[PDB]
Amino acid sequence: GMTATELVNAYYAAFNAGDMPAFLALLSEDVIHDINQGERQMGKARFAAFMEKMNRCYRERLADIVVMQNADGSRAAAEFTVHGQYLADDEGLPTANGQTYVLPAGAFFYIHCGKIARVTNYYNLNDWVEQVA
Amino acid sequence: GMTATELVNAYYAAFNAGDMPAFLALLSEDVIHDINQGERQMGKARFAAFMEKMNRCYRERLADIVVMQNADGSRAAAEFTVHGQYLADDEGLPTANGQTYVLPAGAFFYIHCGKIARVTNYYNLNDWVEQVA
Numbered sequence: 509g510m511t512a513t514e515l516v517n518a519y520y521a522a523f524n525a526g527d528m529p530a531f532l533a534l535l536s537e538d539v540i541h542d543i544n545q546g547e548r549q550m551g552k553a554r555f556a557a558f559m560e561k562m563n564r565c566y567r568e569r570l571a572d573i574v575v576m577q578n579a580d581g582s583r584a585a586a587e588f589t590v591h592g593q594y595l596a597d598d599e600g601l602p603t604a605n606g607q608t609y610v611l612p613a614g615a616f617f618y619i620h621c622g623k624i625a626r627v628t629n630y631y632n633l634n635d636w637v638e639q640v641a
Numbered sequence: 642g643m644t645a646t647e648l649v650n651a652y653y654a655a656f657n658a659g660d661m662p663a664f665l666a667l668l669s670e671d672v673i674h675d676i677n678q679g680e681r682q683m684g685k686a687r688f689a690a691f692m693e694k695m696n697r698c699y700r701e702r703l704a705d706i707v708v709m710q711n712a713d714g715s716r717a718a719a720e721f722t723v724h725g726q727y728l729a730d731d732e733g734l735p736t737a738n739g740q741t742y743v744l745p746a747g748a749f750f751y752i753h754c755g756k757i758a759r760v761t762n763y764y765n766l767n768d769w770v771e772q773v774a
Contacts, residue, residue: 542745545678545767574716576709583707585718587749587761612675614763616720616747628720630747630763634678 512581512619519624520573520586526563532556535624542628555627565604568592570613584617590631594640602641609639645714645752652757653706653719659696665689668757675761688760698737701725703746717750723764727773735774742772 510518515534522531532552541549541558549558573588590613594604613631617624643651648667655664665685674682674691682691706721723746727737746764750757 542765545765574711576711576716576718578707578709583709583720585709585720585747585749587716587718612761614718614747614749614761616718628745628747632675632678 510622512577512584512617513575515581515619515622515624516575516577516584516586516617517573520570520575520588524569528556528559528563531559535627536620539624540618540626542626544629544631545633561598565596565598566592566594582619584619585614586617587612587614589613602637604640607640609636611635611639643755645710645717645750646708648714648752648755648757649708649710649717649719649750650706653703653708653721657702661689661692661696664692668760669753672757673751673759675759677762677764678766694731698729698731699725699727715752717752718747719750720745720747722746735770737773740773742769744768744772 519531519534522528522534532555535552535555537552538550539552539555541555543549549555569591570588571591573586575584575586577584590609590611592609594607594609597604611631613629615630616628618626652664652667655667665688668685668688670685671683672685672688674688676682682688702724703721704724706719708717708719710717723742723744725742727740727742730737744764746762748763749761751759
């Protein structure tokens with residue numbers, strides 16, 4: 509019975525708290541995940557693997573979260589500020605040494621049957637690389 | 642007296658119709674323009690110059706536009722599908738030869754005093770380059 513706004517708020521609450529069971533529970537089994545400047549990854553197993561890797565390499569807190577939805581709650585969007593620390597080398601990227609970064613980001617969502625069926629992530633990758641390189 | 646939704650709909654109507662006076666009229670004089678994977682450009686004059694260049698090099702139609710806002714209309718977001726044709730070489734990018742492209746994109750907005758005060762553009766640049774290269 510959650511609204512789209514509530515669902516997306518719960519997504520980010522779980523993200524911020526590092527509560528992976530709560531986070532993954534909100535996603536459909538066939539969730540589409542559009543990685544910023546990267547590949548479309550399909551399915552919850554791949555999303556769980558993505559989060560495992562992200563948790564190996566980064567810690568992030570999202571601030572200033574603004575969540576919006578369409579009237580029927582099938583579509584949503586969020587804009588926020590990422591506060592992060594780069595903890596361990598991620599593949600294909602600059603070396604990690606604990607550096608901090610701060611940058612705006614956003615996401616778009618498709619919601620169906622009360623689950624998040626698509627997450628599309630956006631941010632300026634060039635800005636992030638400049639901050640950590 | 643327009644709502645944020647109406648304002649953003651007018652922005653995209655003007656974009657789609659190629660009506661530059663109508664498009665630029667919606668923007669604040671000090672509009673912040675966050676170019677996808679690029680620079681923050683400040684001010685309406687720079688935005689007009691950006692559009693002049695864009696119009697020199699591309700023709701785009703946006704489909705499937707979904708516009709969302711926060712309750713007070715200070716923030717908005719749009720997701721859509723870009724249908725484009727690359728008409729003339731743009732600087733720092735692959736050669737143009739009239740190729741077509743289709744890809745999702747989105748934008749985030751800050752609205753103040755009834756004008757668009759920030760436009761932040763997002764899309765997968767790698768996907769676009771792959772489509773035209």
